[PDB]
Design an enzyme around this catalytic site. Structure first.
Site, mmCIF file in Angstrom:
data_model
loop_
_atom_site.group_PDB
_atom_site.id
_atom_site.type_symbol
_atom_site.label_atom_id
_atom_site.label_comp_id
_atom_site.label_asym_id
_atom_site.label_seq_id
_atom_site.Cartn_x
_atom_site.Cartn_y
_atom_site.Cartn_z
ATOM 1 N N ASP A 225 0.059 5.262 1.043
ATOM 2 C CA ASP A 225 -0.123 6.186 2.173
ATOM 3 C C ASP A 225 -0.199 5.439 3.505
ATOM 4 O O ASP A 225 -1.158 4.714 3.759
ATOM 5 C CB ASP A 225 -1.400 7.012 1.963
ATOM 6 C CG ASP A 225 -1.458 8.252 2.840
ATOM 7 O OD1 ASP A 225 -1.759 9.341 2.303
ATOM 8 O OD2 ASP A 225 -1.209 8.149 4.060
ATOM 9 N N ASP B 235 0.881 -1.148 0.000
ATOM 10 C CA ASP B 235 0.000 0.000 0.000
ATOM 11 C C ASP B 235 0.938 1.223 0.000
ATOM 12 O O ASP B 235 2.160 1.089 0.164
ATOM 13 C CB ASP B 235 -0.921 -0.025 1.229
ATOM 14 C CG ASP B 235 -2.181 0.842 1.074
ATOM 15 O OD1 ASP B 235 -2.351 1.562 0.063
ATOM 16 O OD2 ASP B 235 -3.012 0.809 2.010
HETATM 17 MG MG LIG Z 1 -2.509 1.698 3.880
#
Ligand SMILES: [Mg+2]
Ligand SMILES: [Cl-]
Ligand SMILES: [Mg+2]
Lengths: 242, 242
Positions: free
Chosen positions: A9, A7
């Site tokens: 952020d 992922d």
């Molecule tokens: Mg995340």
């Protein structure tokens, strides 16, 4: 043959910030050990570039923007799907028209503008409408908890359009997301699936309801729930420790 | 005691671009001769700063963003009005709810997202909705000319809310603007009105329907229709020639 997926952020960065050279150097060492690196976020390419830097494509083997609907490999776009191309114009105007009626018919107190936001890979729908102030976000975030306005519209839209094979995720405070069943982060797996014995996924929203949850619990994935990117590196360094 | 007012995009610049040091130097000489300089645009401060540069406030005596609803004088905000503060929450949700019904009930072919955009000083309303591609902008721009979809909704909204004392201006291709009768560029005059014998206004959209038209035809204004900013300077230099 292995690949590491992250992922963006909060996983490769702090929560909402640029990446660290400690992170970069941890990734570089990963790559140098024979791993391939991939990245997947609901965010659009622009925002991912903004967080990893301009040399994002030159840094990761794969970059899955909007959960894979726009996809780069070896610095080369190789897949592009859209909400429009999946559903088609009719089904789209139908869904939208009904969103607008529903919303126009709510007995909530504060409504502003931008209630239905059509995006490359998802509908974003807001009863209050996202042209609202932060304060109004909070007033309403509290209203919703008492009245479940987002919950209701979702039930209503679900049962208007069962044939649309759509999925509904609750966004932030004022908004909920709609997209074809499947267009969470596991969308991208179809592409690395066939090329790697093992696939590590790193993410932080891996509790149910989260956007990492689907891909994390996926069985083709070796999941890794992290808190901050600091964790992420520990996991990498131990992975390479051996 | 005189002041020179300028529209921004296309008057002090090329169409959509930064200002020239030829323009700046022409303005500086204006100021140096005893004129005061002001600026007025429907644009929000951010966009005006982006076109005049960071030192905008230090350069003009007055800066009227969103046609004066946000106003600086001597580098000092002295007025801030909003759509919300004028109308009030009720009247706002009422207008919006009805926009959304109208739009949901159109028999047009392409609809996307962002149909009703609530902005500091105006409603922006789009039947197709502004989450649409450029191509779809043009398909629809052509539809409208044949069917007058923007014209109809305006008639409908006008006659739903006569008490709202609202004005309707047709935006670009896909959108129309709504705001309280009066919130065109002449809004700002209330502020310089009482301090200057003569007020020059420079602008390029001074034909009827245009956003310079109201202020240009205003009789407290000495109007100046220009084509490009090149004209603008000629007028200045002749003004200072004497
Ligand atoms: Mg995340
Ligand atoms: Cl809207
Ligand atoms: Mg102009």
């Amino acid at each position: 043959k292995a690949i590491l997926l992250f992922d963006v952020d909060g996983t490769l960065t702090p929560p909402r910030n640029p990446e660290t050279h400690d992170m970069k150097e941890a990734l570089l060492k990963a790559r140098a050990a024979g791993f391939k690196l991939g990245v997947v976020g609901g965010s659009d390419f622009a925002k991912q570039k903004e967080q990893l830097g301009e040399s994002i494509l030159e840094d990761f083997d794969y970059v899955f923007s909007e959960n894979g609907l726009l996809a780069y490999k070896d610095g080369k776009e190789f897949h592009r799907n859209s909400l429009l191309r999946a559903l088609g114009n009719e089904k789209v105007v139908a869904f939208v028209k009904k969103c607008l009626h529903l919303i126009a018919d709510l007995d909530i107190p504060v409504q502003r503008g931008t209630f239905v936001e059509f995006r490359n890979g998802m509908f974003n729908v807001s009863p209050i409408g996202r042209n609202c102030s932060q304060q109004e976000r909070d007033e309403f975030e509290n209203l919703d908890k008492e009245r479940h306005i987002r919950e209701k519209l979702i039930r209503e839209l679900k049962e208007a359009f069962p044939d649309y094979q759509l999925a509904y995720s609750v966004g932030g405070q004022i908004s909920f997301d709609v997209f074809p069943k499947g267009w969470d982060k596991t969308y991208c797996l179809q592409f690395v699936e066939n090329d790697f014995e093992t696939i590590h996924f790193f993410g932080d929203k891996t509790s149910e309801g989260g956007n990492d949850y689907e891909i994390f619990t996926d069985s083709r994935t070796i999941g890794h729930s992290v808190k901050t990117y600091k964790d992420t590196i520990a996991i990498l360094e131990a992975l390479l420790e051996d």
